[PDB]
Structure 1
Amino acid sequence: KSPGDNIDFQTTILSRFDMIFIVKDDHNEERDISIANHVINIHTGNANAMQNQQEENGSEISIEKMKRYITYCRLKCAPRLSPQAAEKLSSNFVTIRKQLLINELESTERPITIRQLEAIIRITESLAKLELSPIAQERHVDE
Structure 2
Amino acid sequence: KSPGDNIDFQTTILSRFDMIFIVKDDHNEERDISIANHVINIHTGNANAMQNQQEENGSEISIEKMKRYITYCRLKCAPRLSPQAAEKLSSNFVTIRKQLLINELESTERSSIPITIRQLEAIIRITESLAKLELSPIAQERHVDEAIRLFQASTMDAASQDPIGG
Cα offsets for 1:53-98 (capped at 9, x unmatched): 1000132111221111100101101110001100100001000000
If asked which structure has higher relative contact order (CA below 8 Å, sep 6+), I would say 2
Structure 2 unaligned runs (5+)? 147-166
Q: Displacement, 1:124? A: 0.5
Query: How far apart are 1:8 and its partner, in Å?
Result: 3.3
Whether the aligned pair in 2 keeps the contact of 1:80 and 1:136 (CA below 8 Å) is: yes
Distance 2:59 2:48 in 1: 15
Structure 1 runs not aligned, ≥5 long:
none
Counterpart in the other structure of 2:34: 34
The reply on whether 1:72 has 2:65 as its aligned counterpart is no
1:131 is displaced (CA, Å) by: 1.1
The percentage of counterpart residues that share the same residue type is 100
CA distance in 2, matches of 1:21, 1:107: 26
Further displaced range: 105-114 or 36-45: 105-114
TM-score, length-normalised on structure 2?
0.80
The question of 1:127 aligning with 2:98 is answered no
Aligned residues: 143
Cα deviations by residue, 1:1-36 (Å, 9 ceiling, x for unpaired): 112234334111100111110001111111111111
Shift of 1:106: 2.8
**What is the CA distance between 1:49 and its match in structure 2?**
4.0
- Give the alignment's Cα RMSD to 1 decimal: 1.6
